[PDB]
């Protein structure tokens, strides 16, 4: 079983937070992967890459493993994680823990018109990491996901349907590529489009409506 150690965890296990949308709205920093687990039940992982890495520790040569792992709803949530461990399944385990932790929303919207569900992206976005840039552009519906394998998996596992990409730099380093792409989808919720201009009233944190609850013993 699992014992929360964070005043966000006890809030969750006591079913005081329904969705992640309440985590994300108030930017409450996750540190207990079980949070993501309960709030996102239908999260399907995927090991993107596994790599033998040669460690040299105090004249003692060892062989470890670096694993690049992606996770996501096929709705609006992604996660990416890199981890190095001493054993392959261990690496993958830890990797999924990390990507669980850094889960992000996504603003997916329309191309031009406005029928059915939002299929593509809302605006053009761009992430950069390392030397790599990855750019994502709204497609029209049924244009599929136009990207190389890796970035394509990352976007599929994030419930994108139709999206043109343009990369640049040494895209052969898949960790920088994935990282950058990750950034670019992780910027969508960050581009003030006119339909978000209307002033809201500031919501009151879960941390204060349920403050007596989930307080340390």
């Amino acid at each position: 079983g699992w014992v929360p150690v964070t005043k966000l965890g006890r809030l969750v296990k006591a079913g005081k937070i329904t969705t992640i949308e309440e985590i994300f709205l108030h930017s409450l920093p996750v540190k207990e992967f079980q949070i993501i687990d309960t709030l996102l039940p239908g999260l399907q992982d995927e090991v993107m890459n596994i790599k033998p890495v040669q460690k040299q520790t105090r004249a003692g040569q060892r062989t470890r493993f670096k694993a690049v792992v992606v996770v996501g709803d096929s709705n609006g949530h992604v996660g990416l994680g890199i981890k190095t461990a001493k054993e392959v399944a261990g690496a993958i385990r830890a990797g999924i823990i990390i990507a669980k932790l850094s889960v992000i929303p996504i603003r997916r919207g329309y191309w031009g018109t406005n029928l059915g569900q939002p299929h593509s992206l809302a605006t053009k976005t761009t992430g950069k990491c390392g030397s790599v840039t990855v750019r994502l552009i709204p497609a029209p519906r049924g244009s599929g996901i136009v990207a190389s394998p890796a970035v394509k998996k990352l976007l599929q596992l994030a419930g994108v349907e139709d999206v043109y990409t343009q990369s640049n730099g040494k895209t052969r380093t898949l960790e920088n590529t994935l990282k950058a792409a990750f950034v670019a989808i992780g910027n969508t919720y960050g581009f003030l489009t006119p339909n978000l201009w209307a002033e809201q009233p500031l919501p009151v944190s879960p941390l204060d409506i349920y403050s007596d609850e989930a307080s340390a013993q």
Binding site: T6, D212, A216
Partner: protein
């Protein structure tokens, strides 16, 4: 949105001036220029203590508004602040970190010093830098006691006073706690001066 009561009292002002909270350091960050009232011919600046006051009232309203009076954290590695803060904690029931702030006390749930505030108050935003830096990693509002040359990075509601002299320090802390308790109801009326002396907050060494 505050009554004719909360205005600065002659007595209060006397306390302040007695403890030279009005004496600001020699240099002014462009960020705290509005606080500066005038500059003396020797190169020492003067603080609008009216503003010191109103910022005290503000910090108090905030410290008040927090649901669980345990979550608020007073901090100081600064010598004088140790003594003062401890008392602050006592009368206000907030949690205190005197002396050495262990790194990762706001990240890292594994260490034993792990705490999850909902407001940090800090004596010196320079010597206590790391606590501010670390609060910044986890959405924790900082309310500091800044001189006119204190880094106003990652602080909201600065209280312009004098981080140097112990009187200023103790006095400000004490005034702070007092205002908080006046807000909670703990010190019923507002005409009644605190039965407790500010000197309890002062730093004493044998």
């Amino acid at each position: 949105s505050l009554p004719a009561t909360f205005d600065l009292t002659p007595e209060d002002a006397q306390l302040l001036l007695a403890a030279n909270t009005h004496l600001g350091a020699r240099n002014v960050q462009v960020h705290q220029e509005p606080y500066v009232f005038n500059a003396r011919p020797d190169g020492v600046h003067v603080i609008n203590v009216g503003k010191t006051w109103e910022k005290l009232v503000l910090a108090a309203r905030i410290i008040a508004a927090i649901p669980n009076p345990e979550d608020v954290v007073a901090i100081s590695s600064r010598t004088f602040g140790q003594r003062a803060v401890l008392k602050f904690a006592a009368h206000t029931g907030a949690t205190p970190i005197a002396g050495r702030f262990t790194p990762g006390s706001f990240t890292n749930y594994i260490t034993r010093s792990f705490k999850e505030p909902r407001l940090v108050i800090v004596t010196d935003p320079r010597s206590d830098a790391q606590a501010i830096k670390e609060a910044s990693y986890v959405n924790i509002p900082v309310i500091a006691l800044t001189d006119l040359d204190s880094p106003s990075e990652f602080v909201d509601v600065a209280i312009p006073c004098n981080n140097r002299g112990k009187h200023s320090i103790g006095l400000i802390w004490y005034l702070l706690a007092r205002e908080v308790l006046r807000l909670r109801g703990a010190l019923v009326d507002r005409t009644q001066p605190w039965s407790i002396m500010p000197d309890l907050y002062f730093y004493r060494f044998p």
